Amino acid sequence: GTRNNKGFGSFTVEYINNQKNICNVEDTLKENFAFVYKKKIALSRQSTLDFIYIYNQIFSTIKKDYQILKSGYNFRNEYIKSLLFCYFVSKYPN
RNA sequence: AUUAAGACAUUCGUGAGUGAUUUAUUUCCAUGAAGUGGCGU
Numbered sequence A: 001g002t003r004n005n006k007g008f009g010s011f012t013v014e015y016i017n018n019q020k021n022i023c024n025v026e027d028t029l030k031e032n033f034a035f036v037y038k039k040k041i042a043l044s045r046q047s048t049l050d051f052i053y054i055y056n057q058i059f060s061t062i063k064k065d066y067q068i069l070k071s072g073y074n075f076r077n078e079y080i081k082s083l084l085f086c087y088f089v090s091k092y093p094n
Numbered sequence B: 001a002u003u004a005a006g007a008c009a010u011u012c013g014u015g016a017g018u019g020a021u022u023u024a025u026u027u028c029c030a031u032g033a034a035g036u037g038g039c040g041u
Helices: A025-032 A051-070 A083-090
Strands: none
Touching: A051 A083
């Protein structure tokens, strides 16, 4: 998709030739990627209602974390520095 | 006046009749409508 790296492309295969697919996501991610990082998001009750609410939480969390990574967060009142910044100013501090 | 004289190789006659420039052949192969957020710790 467009901006698929941020998560608007997620698919899984269920039936291959009318046979269920027991493929572990964790193991395949471990195999084909250099680093794989899991985050357990607090699914506040629901989980049976408001997939729209689930999407809102998931994508707000992604925006949160990725804005944290390469930039800061000058939003409401809480300041956390850019970890992309903090990496370079620490390693060989120039 | 002499084994001489006389005599168009000529008349008639369609290079014509039959017969598809046709048969076979993918305008196709490769290819992300995608990338990035920025601003006041």
